[PDB]
Amino acid sequence: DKVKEKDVQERISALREQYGETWHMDREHPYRTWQYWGSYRTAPTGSAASLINGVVKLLSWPWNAREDVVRMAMTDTTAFGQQRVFKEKVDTKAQEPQPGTKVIMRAVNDWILERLARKSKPRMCSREEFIAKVKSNQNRWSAKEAVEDPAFWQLVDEERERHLAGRCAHCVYNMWYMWLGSRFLEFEALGFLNEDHWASRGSSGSGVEGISLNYLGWYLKGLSTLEGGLFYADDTAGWDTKVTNADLEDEEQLLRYMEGEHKQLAATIMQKAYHAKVVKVARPSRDGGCVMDVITRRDQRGSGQVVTYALNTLTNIKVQLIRMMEGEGVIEASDAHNPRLLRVERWLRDHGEERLGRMLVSGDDCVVRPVDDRFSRALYFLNDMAKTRKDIGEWEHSVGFSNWEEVPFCSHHFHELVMKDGRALIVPCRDQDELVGRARVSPCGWSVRETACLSKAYGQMWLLSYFHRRDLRTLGLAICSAVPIDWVPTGRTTWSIHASGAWMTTEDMLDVWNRVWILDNPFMHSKEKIVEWRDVPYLPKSHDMLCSSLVGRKERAEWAKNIWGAVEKVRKMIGQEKFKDYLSCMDR
Amino acid sequence: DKVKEKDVQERISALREQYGETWHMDREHPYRTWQYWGSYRTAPTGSAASLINGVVKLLSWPWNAREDVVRMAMTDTTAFGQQRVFKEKVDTKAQEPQPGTKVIMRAVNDWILERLARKSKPRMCSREEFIAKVKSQNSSAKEAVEDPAFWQLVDEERERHLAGRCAHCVYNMMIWYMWLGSRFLEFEALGFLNEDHWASRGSSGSGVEGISLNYLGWYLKGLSTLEGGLFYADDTAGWDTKVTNADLEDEEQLLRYMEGEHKQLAATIMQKAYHAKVVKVARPSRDGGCVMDVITRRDQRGSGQVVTYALNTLTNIKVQLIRMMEGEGVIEASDAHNPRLLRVERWLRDHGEERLGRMLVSGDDCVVRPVDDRFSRALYFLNDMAKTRKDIGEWEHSVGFSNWEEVPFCSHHFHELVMKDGRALIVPCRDQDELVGRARVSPGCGWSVRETACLSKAYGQMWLLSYFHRRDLRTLGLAICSAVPIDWVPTGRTTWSIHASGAWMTTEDMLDVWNRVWILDNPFMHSKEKIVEWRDVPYLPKSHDMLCSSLVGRKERAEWAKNIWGAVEKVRKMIGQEKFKDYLSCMD
Ligand SMILES: [Mg+2]
Ligand SMILES: [Mg+2]
Ligand SMILES: [Zn+2]
Ligand SMILES: [Zn+2]
Ligand SMILES: [Zn+2]
Ligand SMILES: [Zn+2]
Known part of the structure; x- marks a missing residue:
């Protein structure tokens, strides 16, 4: 059994036995720090077998050999698999922090919301806005379809009126997201955090919300000064x-x-939906089918809450701001017991604004540039707050970097390139094998056209952000030469919230390049457009190979030679459509 | 010596001591779990020296220095060889399953037999049938069936079978082989299993009888969805x-x-011939000669029974339905000795038929695609029906595969191949050096230059048809066809697998037959435009060609494939003044 957990708030919500036909109670259930409330038969779904995108396979055949380009479809959406992940990573309980710590935390936290609030007040959001966002991309309906049928709104109205009263009956998680009705209720109460950009750099000081990968490098570099x-x-x-x-x-x-x-409206969401969580989890039944468990708990963040990004940013800002204090000497392990609150409030009055600009924080990722490297050893309040560092001993000093071009952020590194005309670019870089490998994973039932369109999405994106990687420019130019001109791209290429998505157009990819890298780039003083891909720089070849480029091997060399043969196969595969030749505009 | 023995159904069979001139009774025989009934002197036969095909050695001399083409040479068919293999692998007793296991078995089994009975009922097969098969015991079977004396022999044993007694159905273990009259008796009784395609996919669900090896890959890839x-x-x-x-x-x-x-007639065959076995096994005598032992046994299967494949398929379908059911919860190891029979009856009726289509079963070989990876730990009932998994600990968890292209089946992998015209092929693949090694083996001494040439054509055409996608094999196959006369018809078995079409034992143009099997008769190819020249048939990715054995790079091969035409000429001068065509030059 669990120790800390929910109580009477979960009741109205758990007490929809609308799966009553199959409701029961599995005494042999696995959950330990979650609370078991019953279960019901559900259609078994998921798979462990990998589906491979064929057009990307055809065009990138040396990446068969490589090993870390195959483990991305080592996935497991099967109940049995998801259950294993859950029992290893989700079913624990974080050590809550000691009472002094909690006092420092509230001090820093309330300081931060105060700052944020004076710029733009909290606010409710309108149905007409939810409509717009939906219209830009329990089951009686699409998403656009649902927000039209007034029966839908008549449903939210019912639950909304319950929330006004301070209860809810519908605001459950599917392990970790919800359905349109409750998603609108979140968006209404707390959606201001996103729509009024509370996690932006202007508002929170150290957030980076709204900056794409393509400009983040300027911020990293600015920190080095x-x-x-x-x-x-x-x-x-x-x-x-x-x-x-x-x-x-x-x-x-x-x-x-x-x-x-x-x-x-807000408080029901914040302390019923989010703090008294009711979760639906699938699990294999002992009779050849699938049961759904209903579990509860108090802490942890549901990853698919409307405002997970914002809250995690604000919360992680606070954690880093505290770590800064410990390392400077403002607090010490003593303060975990009887805290010197006036000491932290002075530091915020006198240095908070400046410390805020010393860090980039995007959700749970940070880059921190502290006033000196005492920060390495400053682990007491970090471990006390449970933010246990990955892949390092609990009390082992944190290792840092003096070259900003080596600092990782948002799954990337950033390098500075100087173009042929003397203007500097700072470009986001990533493991080549990691990026091809995700593109080789198919979302079955995807037709030759739908899978071609998904590939163009990846190819177009590679041209916006990894044009400086020989292998990827080639591979993205080939994909665009093998997919019809007017097939609009579709599909998820990244999950980062620094994705422009600016590549899901059917505009010219050079033209979008100039738009983002020059015309709209606020760090480009001169706005002279570039005319051909031959004038867009590359990383230095050493860097290319080192970030796991094939540049060098007979493999990559022979792949590059015979790559038009691949392109023609995809065309023949696709039929009598309008193709254009972008590979050759590599003076080739 | 044994503990599970035959009784009185052996007596009339073993009552041919009409080898009596030398019948005796070795007190120094080695059998533990078989029963000794007497030896008798025979002509010693069989060799352990490798006799290598002349023409195939001439045209592939790289592979001489290869302990992968000479691992096939070492096959010892001396009575001492047979004997040593027997004692190690065949003279054992499987532990019989527990009583509840046994119930579950007859439960699942009966479900299966009923299902196929309801789709086609057991029938007899006429002598017209048997005569027709033959067109395709002291000449050939073609002659043996025209003389009505051989048929009078059949009726003699046929009337004894109707009575419930066997006189002549005895296995030779050159545990099985038989003489014409006795094979017909089995074929007449149980031969519907073959002739009515009971192991057909359409009839058994999991079976693959009839699917050519050139088409199976479509079935493998289908499972991935x-x-x-x-x-x-x-x-x-x-x-x-x-x-x-x-x-x-x-x-x-x-x-x-x-x-x-x-x-x-069938109860006799199944219960006398198949289940109370009288087996002739050669062993070396102690006076410079051979002796044939007459041994008997209750269980195990003869490999050359007319319906070994069908019976093996069916029983394996049963074994694997049971294992799913262990790892699905339906069966819990405790009911090995007190069976929850109702559970397995529910599972069968509700879920069962869709489970059939997640397996590919061909004799003792399967590809299974379970409901989730619990199946990898479900080894209680698999170890209880004695079906011990090879090359892995008895209780060690199974190891799966996510990529259908990495799954092995019928001694083959399957890869997808896109042709220049954009159509897709799924070709079978196998270790190049195991393939050539098997051709380098001459089936008998005193084969003449003419007949060993004919056998090399048989291999060469087979390679051309199913392994055309290997650079080295296509060369070798084409060279062979250029070194052997055009009007010389191929002879001999090039493969024992029941999925061999044999379509290559023609003297028709191989491209013609290629197009007929990969396009014309190919059910998975919905465009029947034909291919004019070998230069248009695809290859396996050059990287995939060298991981799957091959030389490709290897200067040792570049030398070979350079002057291979020097070898073709040698073989021709060797063969004679005959009609040769130059298939090699239609390539690059
Ligand atoms: Mg980081
Ligand atoms: Mg197998
Ligand atoms: Zn609610
Ligand atoms: Zn890089
Ligand atoms: Zn008989
Ligand atoms: Zn292969």
């Missing part, structure tokens, strides 16, 4: 399962800045 | 020796779908 210690870029092992109750209570202080129906 | 776990392709260590008495009785309940003469 400050006085201080090394760049630090520790990562927290499994952030969402370490969001403690202290953490959640701190973020509920956002409620104070609201009033009226908005404060109520 | 199923929701489920990984692919599993455990291979059982020496299947036929683990076919237990349990297994045989279950098969025997096939008699409940016959009436009258049938149910007796």
Whole structure:
């Protein structure tokens, strides 16, 4: 059994036995720090067998040999598999922090919301807005389809009216997301955090919301001009399962800045839906089919909440701001017991604004440039707050970097390139094998056209952000020469919230390049457009090979030669459509 | 010496001591779990020296210095060889399954037999049938069936079978081989299993009888589109020796779908010939000669029984339905000795028929695609029906595959291949050096230059038809066809697998037959435009060609494939003044 857990708030919500035909109670259930409330037969779904995108396979055949380009479809959407992941990574309980720590945390936290709030007040959001966002991309309906049928709104109206009263009956997680009705209720109460850009750099000081990968490098580089210690870029092992109750209570202080129906609407979401969670988890039944368990708990963050990104940013800002304090000397392990609160409030009054600009924080990822490297050893309040660092001993010093071009952020590194005309670019880089490998994974039942379109998405994206990788420019230019001109791209190419998506057009890819890298790039003073791909730079060849490029081997050499043969196969595969030749505009 | 013995159904059979001139009774015989009934002197036969095909050695001299083409040379057919193989692999007793296991077995089995009976009922097969097969014991079987004396012999043993006694159905273990009259008796009784295609995919669900090896890959790749776990392709260590008495009785309940003469002729074959075995095994005498032992046994299967494939398929379908059911929850190891029979009856009726289509079963070989990867730990009932997985610990978890292209089946992998015209092929593949090694083996001493040439053509055309996608094999196959006369018709078996079409034992143009099997008669090719020249048939990716053995790069080969025409000429001058065409030059 669990120790800390939900109580009477879960009742109205668990007490939809609308799967009553199959409701039962599996005494042999696995859950330990979650609370088992019953289960019901559900259609078994998921698979462990990998599906491979054929057009990307055809065009990138040396990547068969490579090993880390195949483990991306070592996935497992099967109940049995998902259950294993859950029992290893989700079913624990974070050690909540000691009471002094909690006092420092509330101090820093409330300081942060105060800052944020004075720029733009909390606010409710309109159905007409939810409509717009839906219209830009329990089951009686698409998403566009649902928001039209007034029966849908008549449903949210029912649950909304319940929330105003302070209960809800429908706001359950499918392990970790919800359905349109409750998703609108979130968006209404808390959607201001996203739509009013509370996690932007202007608002939160150290957030980076709204900056694409294509400009983030300028920010990394700007950090190197400050006085201080090394760049630090520790990562927290499994952030969402370490969001403690202290953490959640701190973020509920956002409620104070609201009033009226908005404060109520918000508080039900914040402390029923989010803090008294009711989760649907699939699990294999002992009779050849699939059961769904209903579990509850208090802490941890549901990864698919409407405002996970914002809250994780604000919360992680606070964690880093505290770590800064410990390392500077403002707090020490003593303060975990009887904290010197006036000491932290002075530091915020006197240095908070400056420390804010010393870090880039995007959800659970940071880059931190502290005033000196005492930050390495400053692990007490970090471990106390449960934000246990990945792949390092609990009390082992954090290792830093003096070259910003080596600091990892948002799954990337950033390098500076100088073009032929003397203008500098700072480009996002990533493992070539990691990027091809995700493109080789198919979302079955995807027709030759739908899979061609998904590939163009990857190819177009590679041209916006990894044009500086020989292998990828070639491979993206080939994909665009093998997929019809007017097939609009479709599909998810990245999950980062720094994805432009600017490549899901059917515009010329050079033309979008100039748009993002020059015309709209705020760091380009001169706005002279570039005319041909031959004038867009590359990384230095050493860097290319080192970030796992095939450049060098007979493999890559012979692949590059025979690559038109591949392109023609895909064309013949696709039929009598309009193709154009972008590969040859490599002076080839 | 044994503990599970035959009795009185052996006596009339072993009552041919009409080898009596030398019949005796070695007190120094080696049999533990077989029964000794007497030896008798025979002409010593068989060799352990490798006799290598002349023409294939001339045209592929690289592979001489290769301990992969000479591992096939070492086949010892001396009575001492046979004997040593026997004692190690065949003279054992499988542990018989537990009583509940046994119930579950007859439960699942009966489900299966009923299902196919309801689709086609057991029948007899006429002598017209048997005569027709033959067109395709002291000449050939073609002659043996025209002389009505051989047929009078049949009736003699036929009337004894109707009586319930066997005189001549005895196995030769050159555990099985038989003489014409006795084979017809088996064929007349049980031969519907073959002639009515009971192991057909359409009839058995999991079977693959009739699918050419050139088409199976479409079936493998189809499985990937199923929701489920990984692919599993455990291979059982020496299947036929683990076919237990349990297994045989279950098969025997096939008699409940016959009436009258049938149910007796068949009950005799199944219960006398198949289940009370009299086997002739050679062993070396102690006076410079051979002696044939006459031994008997209850269980195991003869490999050359007329319906070994069908019976083996069916019983394996049963074994694997049971293992799913262990790892699906339906069966819990505790009910090995007190069976929850109702569970397995529900599973069968509700889920069962869709489970049939997640397996590919061909004799003792399967590809299974379970509901989830619990199947990898479900080894209690698999170890209980004695079907021990080979090359892995008895309780060690199975290892799956996510990529259908990495799944092995019928001694082959399958890869997808896109042609220049854009159509897709799924070709079978196998280790190049095992393939050439088998051709380098001459089937007998005193084969003449003419007949060993004919046998090399048989291999060369087979390679051309199913392994055309290997650079080295296509060369070798084409060279062989250029060194052997055009009007010389291929002879001999080039493969024992039941999935061999044989379509290559023609003297027709190989491209012609290529197009007929890959396009014209190919059910998975919905465009029947034909291919004018070999230069248009695809290859396997050059990287995939050298991982799957091959030389390709290897200067040793570039030398070979340079002056291979020097070898063709040698073989021609060797053969004579005959009609030769130059198939090599239609290539690059
Ligand atoms: Mg990082
Ligand atoms: Mg196998
Ligand atoms: Zn609700
Ligand atoms: Zn890089
Ligand atoms: Zn007989
Ligand atoms: Zn292969």
